[PDB]
Design an enzyme around this catalytic site. Structure first.
Site, short mmCIF file in Angstrom:
data_model
loop_
_atom_site.label_atom_id
_atom_site.label_comp_id
_atom_site.label_asym_id
_atom_site.label_seq_id
_atom_site.Cartn_x
_atom_site.Cartn_y
_atom_site.Cartn_z
CB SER A 81 40.27 30.73 25.88
OG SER A 81 40.70 29.52 25.29
CG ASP A 103 42.92 35.98 44.73
OD1 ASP A 103 42.80 35.51 43.58
OD2 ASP A 103 41.94 36.32 45.45
#
EC number: 3.4.23.22
Length: 330
Positions: free
Chosen positions: A199, A35
């Site tokens: 992004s 994770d």
């Protein structure tokens, strides 16, 4: 040193991925959920409340000649999905894919929430976010990667998750045969303890690319892609009959649909998520309403590039002095 381990979807939907991890002496192999959005290595154990164990493999520290109680240390964690676990702490030898760390903090669960109990395939979590998020008190502990880093050939690990198929976590090297083209690297902020990046935009299907900054985290422990409501609405508007259902808890779509792809930007590069990756199947057995793999982050407080996004790429988690993230197509 290096390590290399195969990671395997837990079910036919790729809800999560498990990777075998050797703990203790002799080795006890547990299948852990790696994770990159958390920083605790915790396991089902011989200390876990019996009624909360249902099929998991447990770590038994009393059977490990290298286990030592970390006296006075406790831990307690809550995840974004509302699940939780807590307990005490041992140090022991931990190996992943041939890479060994001695003195790793292994957090033994005394209690786990129902979601963990109900998932027989996940024996615990191995956190790969920054150690500043580790919950051990009163002495915070380091992640497996942080402990291994100085010994690695290069201070990196890579995630290569499969779509409905196994994939690979590598430590200490970049497998140049595992991706196509080049890797595009992008800046990371560690201010919140995550692999947080920005992004450069998105496209839906064959549509034009929208240049817009989307701050979010690369999180292998989250199944879906969670993005701003504007972006998510633009995606689902291209699917006839798709709608946001408050009763189901997100966007659903007719199972008869063919889903468009979704592209996200990494600098000037582009990663394309095929439409099929966005299908999470019937909302309940036999239903013709299917659950979407792109959902709104509104009210989470952060955008999450979870498995839906990451499995479309070869992803480099670069833990150099100034961390960065790399993405390549594959």
């Amino acid at each position: 040193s290096t390590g290399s381990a195969t990671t395997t979807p837990i079910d036919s939907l790729d809800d999560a991925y498990i990777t075998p991890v050797q703990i203790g002496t002799p080795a006890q192999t547990l299948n852990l959920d790696f994770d990159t959005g958390s920083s605790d290595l915790w396991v089902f154990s011989s200390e876990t409340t019996a009624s909360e164990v249902d099929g998991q493999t447990i770590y038994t520290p009393s059977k490990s000649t290298t286990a030592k109680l970390l006296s006075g240390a406790t831990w307690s964690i809550s995840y974004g999905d509302g699940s939780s676990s807590s307990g005490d702490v041992y140090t022991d030898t931990v190996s992943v894919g041939g890479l060994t760390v001695t003195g790793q903090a292994v957090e033994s669960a005394k209690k786990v929430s129902s979601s963990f109990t109900e998932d027989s395939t996940i024996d615990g979590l191995l956190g790969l976010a920054f150690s500043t998020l580790n919950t051990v008190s009163p002495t915070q502990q380091k992640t497996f990667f942080d402990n291994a880093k100085a010994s690695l050939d290069s201070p990196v690990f890579t995630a290569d998750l499969g779509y409905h198929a196994p994939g690979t976590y590598n430590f200490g090297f970049i497998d140049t045969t595992a991706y196509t083209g080049s890797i595009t690297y992008t800046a990371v902020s560690t201010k919140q303890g995550f692999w947080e990046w920005t992004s450069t935009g998105y496209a839906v299907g064959s549509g034009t690319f929208k240049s817009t900054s989307i701050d979010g985290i690369a999180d292998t422990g989250t199944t879906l892609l969670y993005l701003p409501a504007t972006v998510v609405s633009a995606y689902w508007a291209q699917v006839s009959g798709a709608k946001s259902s408050s009763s189901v808890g997100g966007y659903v779509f007719p199972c008869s649909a063919t889903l468009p792809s979704f592209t996200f930007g990494v600098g000037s590069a582009r990663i394309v998520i095929p439409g099929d990756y966005i299908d999470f199947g019937p909302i309940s057995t036999g239903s013709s309403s299917c659950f979407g793999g792109i959902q709104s982050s509104a009210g989470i407080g952060i955008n999450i590039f979870g498995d839906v996004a990451l499995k479309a790429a070869f992803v480099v988690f670069n833990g150099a002095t100034t961390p960065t993230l790399g993405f390549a197509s594959k």
